[model samples]
Target: AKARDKLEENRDLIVERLKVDEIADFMIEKGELTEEEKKKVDAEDSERKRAEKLVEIVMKMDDAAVKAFYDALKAKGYSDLASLLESGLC
Candidate 1:
């Protein structure tokens, strides 16, 4: 549960600050997300909802997807978030 724990701890901040579409596109490129999953997340009406969907999906995936999530954020310039998950402390 380590990866999930980190995500849950930072869920609020992620919901507030994540650029869901951009990160989703990155994850898609990384093969962590399928076109259908991206479409599902994109189906959300607002940024917050999209982030929530993404978190939920990523949590359900294996730990590697969690790493992809972190990497996606970092590559997309979400340095604080990437570091937050990387440090795994809050």
Candidate 2:
């Protein structure tokens, strides 16, 4: 929930900063992305569009996918983006 909401709130930032191809590999390894979804992401003509589609796909996925998405980012050294989704006490 926290990750999904954070993702929606930071859509612009994510689109600007994300390395979609790298993250997509991690997501696939994490079992979060199917071949069809990966094709959708790869079909995008630009990194920005790829990132947009990745986020959209994750948003429609289950809680595990959302968590895996965050983990994938962190695992791939996108700490700044990962930080946005990190659940914290406030």
Candidate 3:
């Protein structure tokens, strides 16, 4: 019960932190990132996508399944769902 409560609190903290658009604006204001920097970040993102894709493919899932999984996360009030998608979910 204590662990669950802690998890809920942490999840709420994440959701609250994400509510601020300043993070997005700050990234954009950091000035145009170099191709190298962008490529590095892109590579990391691609790796994450590949992992996620593998999970979906192995699970024989579709967009609905993905959306469902995301919905579950959202139901739990997870804020990291947006980052799970390349262009942000929804």
Top-lDDT structure, candidate number: 1
Pairs of residues at least 3 apart in sequence or in different chains that clash in candidate 2: none
Top TM-score hit: 1
Better of 1 and 3 by lDDT: 1
TM-score of 1: 0.91
Residue 61 Cα positional deviation in candidate 3, in Å, after optimal superposition: 1.2
Which parts of model 1 have CA positions greater than 4 angstroms off? 88-90
- Tell me the tens digit of each residue's lDDT in model 3 across 1-90: 232233334443334334222322232244322334333434434444433322323134334433443344454454564334324332
Specify the poorest-scoring 10-residue window by lDDT in model 1: 81-90
Q: Report the Cα lDDT for residue 77, model 3.
A: 56
Q: Each candidate's lDDT (Cα)?
A: 0.86, 0.83, 0.36
Off by over 4 Å in 2: 88-90
TM-score of 3: 0.29
- What lDDT is reached at residue 69 by model 2? 81
lDDT of 1 by residue, 25-76 (tens): 8888888999899899989999899999999999888887898898898899
Q: Is candidate 1 or candidate 2 better by TM-score?
A: 1
What's the number of clashes in each of the models?
0, 0, 0
Report the C-alpha displacement of residue 8, candidate 2, in angstroms.
0.4
